[PDB]
Design a protein around this ligand. Structure first.
Ligand SMILES: *C(=S)NCCc1ccc(S(N)(=O)=O)cc1
Ligand SMILES: *C(=S)NCCc1ccc(S(N)(=O)=O)cc1
Ligand SMILES: *C(=S)NCCc1ccc(S(N)(=O)=O)cc1
Lengths: 114, 114, 114
């Protein structure tokens, strides 16, 4: 699992421990061990959501499996909740794209997971 | 619809109104009201295109529907035109990836669109 | 072909000719002319991999074709090797996502490649 957050909120507004919390919460949500999880947080971005520059985020979650209708609703509740509580971004100014990756299309450690 | 532009043009060369211009023009092109459209512009990037560091852009357009052969050819004209006029990028140094998203794979407001 | 590498290693630790090397090596690996290859390197990122902020990278390679099981294993050896030699990133702290794009979904110069 790989989670990327792009946001216009300033870097100073990202709390200490945020990347750790994301790693832990995504491990619980996906069932995968934390060693597998990558997080990437990108603050201070030039963004608009609905033509407004108020706090917003564009995110993506890539995973080898564990992607689907019900799971994605659960991930959205979790991840919008964290962006609201920790970065003060309204959930209706967040988009999250979910991508189910084939293992043969994910490289790691000089090879692929195929 | 979500439109992302990655470019090596400096931040100071991105007009203040560019995000709003892109929002409005994408609303007209996709038929979706502007409240649904998100835009992200990423300047000052370390990039090469054809082995040259002259101005260039790598872009993505994600949308639930409104993606297809003919539509994508039309979007390329709209977006090349905007990047040429406002960021002074040659249109042969622009790539745009088009992604047709399933509503079940787009999170928003604690849920998904499915 | 389009290759993007996001990393937490500092900008100052990216060698001068790194973009050029990636372009030439991707041309040899993919068989496509360098004039069609785009490269994008993003240092200084806020990232965690397995819960650790030691040097890591999240990358993607997009191509119209030339993506597949054994091919992706070969790309991973090539690219992990370059990230290890030049950026000092351990290969077990690199993920690379491989994307086989339909030509109708790749825009360039006021049209698509279809
Ligand atoms: C998230 S994209 N992690 C990539 C690493 C990885 C390795 C194995 C598996 S498994 N055995 O299919 O659960 C998932 C993810
Ligand atoms: C772009 S990715 N917008 C996502 C939000 C969205 C997309 C489509 C529609 S609709 N009801 O099909 O017009 C609404 C909202
Ligand atoms: C990478 S995504 N390049 C853009 C698409 C593409 C693919 C192949 C060729 S060629 N000249 O036939 O090798 C050009 C452009």
């Amino acid at each position: 699992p790989m989670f990327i957050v792009n946001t216009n909120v300033p870097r100073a507004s990202v709390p200490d421990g945020f990347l750790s919390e994301l790693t832990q919460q995504l491990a619980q949500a996906t069932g995968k061990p934390p060693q597998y999880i990558a997080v990437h947080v990108v603050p201070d971005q030039l963004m608009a959501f609905g033509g407004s520059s108020e706090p917003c985020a564009l995110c993506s979650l890539h995973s080898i499996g564990k992607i689907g209708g019900a799971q994605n609703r659960s991930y959205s509740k979790l991840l919008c909740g964290l962006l609201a509580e920790r970065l003060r971004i309204s959930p209706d100014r967040v988009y999250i794209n979910y991508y189910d990756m084939n293992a043969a299309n994910v490289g790691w450690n000089n090879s692929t997971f195929a």
